[PDB]
Design a protein around this ligand. Structure first.
Ligand SMILES: C[C@H](CCCC(C)(C)O)[C@@H]1CCCC[C@H]2/C(=C/C=C3C[C@@H](O)C(=CCCO)[C@H](O)C3)CCC[C@@]21C
Ligand SMILES: C[C@H](CCCC(C)(C)O)[C@@H]1CCCC[C@H]2/C(=C/C=C3C[C@@H](O)C(=CCCO)[C@H](O)C3)CCC[C@@]21C
Lengths: 10, 238, 238, 10
């Protein structure tokens, strides 16, 4: 998916 | 009078902005240095990527955006990020310089530097007018902040799922912005309409940018200069 | 005697190296500045990405690699790129400094800087020994160059299709390297075995790097710092 | 596929 977005959003 | 919740919404939205905005621009010294072909695309893509990160940290501190499903939070950021960057960039922008002034002359992006990052004047004409039109609106920080959270929480963005919940948020914010300008901005009987106009202005700047983004990203020799996060946020993913 | 074709193969492989290697390291001033957490991952990922580009330009000038199907050229670069970078880095590496010296002290990567790009000493121990073991081999430029093209054109790489054609190339190169050291390197009766040993050394440095690459890339807060090209070449694509 | 690799290789 949106790996980095998921991560930054927790 | 502003209620007790609407004043906490103001205090909390300002806090969010103050955490994710660095008035020293000191983290700029760690971008790829600028050059003045597309000599400016690496430093400027770094700036956009840096910004996207700060926009996510703003959004996560907006009341109840944290509560929205992760799909909704992605879809909102995916379609609103470039508007919220264009919106926040006003803080560095200078009417006198006609350029964003982010520290020393090394981070003074005039209009020439921006054309040297792949973007044509069809995006740069409306954007500079937006910046000075928003600037001249001499907004209070409590309105600049509020307008940002409002542009974010729009339900009319592609691929949002719970329209009624993020509309419930945005209205509650619009209520706070209107009562702020009445009770608190001396002279703003016209202002809330001016601000809501900048929102429509944005969506049309968004259209031109994301169209010119397709031009750059379909050229792998240029998309090579972007960053993993830019490519993810401005990508056409679902 | 070296034949007429094997001497053109030498002249052409040296030309390739001289085009894709900048002994001034001047394009380094346009990487993300280094920091001395992973303070070094952005500048060093930029260096790796910069290198990958120079490795592709080397390969395209190797005789008949241009002729190989694009799938084969991708598969070769995908699995050989990190070895050819480790191989080319010897040029800047210094026995005295125990560090690659790429200009001023800003581009003097000692062993500490490298641990600060996500890589542990399990990769850094064998790599520094490789560098000084290759360095001490005091290779002629015609052997350093030849060894690079040989490591590239190995058919025993995952997902190559025409083994027999890229083997036909690599052998022809091995023939040129052996005749060079006999006819031209005074004292290298042992050397061609030493070089072919560095090749096996590489594959084991490749294994450790690409294992430690999975550690970094599975962390999106770190893979965020990589570059579109790094992620593409060191990715697990097919 | 490998967009940038394809491009760099011509
Ligand atoms: C053309 C070019 C790159 C497009 C890159 C591509 C290919 C992905 O389209 C940008 C045009 C429009 C976006 C914002 C533009 C600007 C923002 C300026 C800010 C300064 C500061 O006010 C701040 C943060 C500092 C502290 O947070 C803001 O986030 C951003 C002005 C300079 C030009 C760009 C970067
Ligand atoms: C740890 C770290 C990053 C890993 C990044 C990740 C996460 C993708 O693994 C590298 C370790 C092993 C690769 C080469 C290492 C080095 C190369 C040095 C060169 C200098 C010059 O000789 C030259 C080119 C200049 C002109 O072309 C070479 O290409 C590269 C030494 C410093 C360390 C790295 C970069």
């Amino acid at each position: 998916k949106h790996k980095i977005l998921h991560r930054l959003l927790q | 009078m502003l209620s007790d919740e609407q004043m906490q919404i103001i205090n909390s939205l300002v806090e969010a902005h103050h955490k994710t905005y660095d008035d020293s621009y000191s983290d700029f010294v760690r971008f790829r240095p600028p050059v003045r072909r597309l000599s400016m695309l690496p430093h400027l893509a770094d700036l956009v990527s840096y910004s996207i990160q700060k926009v996510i940290g703003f959004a996560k501190m907006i009341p109840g955006f944290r509560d929205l499903t992760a799909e909704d939070q992605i879809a909102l950021l995916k379609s609103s990020a470039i508007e919220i960057i264009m919106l926040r960039s006003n803080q560095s922008f200078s009417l006198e310089d006609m350029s964003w002034s982010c520290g020393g002359p090394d981070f003074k992006y005039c209009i020439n530097d921006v054309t040297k990052a792949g973007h044509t004047l069809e995006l740069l004409e409306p954007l500079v007018k937006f910046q000075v039109g928003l600037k001249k609106l001499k907004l209070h920080e409590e309105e600049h902040v509020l307008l940002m959270a409002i542009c974010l929480l729009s339900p009319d963005r592609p691929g949002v799922q719970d329209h009624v919940r993020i509309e419930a948020l945005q209205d509650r914010l619009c209520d706070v912005l209107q009562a702020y300008i009445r009770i608190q901005h001396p002279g703003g009987r016209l202002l809330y309409a001016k601000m809501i106009q900048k929102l429509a202005d944005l969506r049309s700047l968004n259209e031109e940018h994301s169209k010119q983004y397709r031009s750059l990203s379909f050229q792998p020799e240029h998309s090579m200069q972007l960053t993993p996060l830019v490519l993810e946020v401005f990508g056409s993913e679902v």
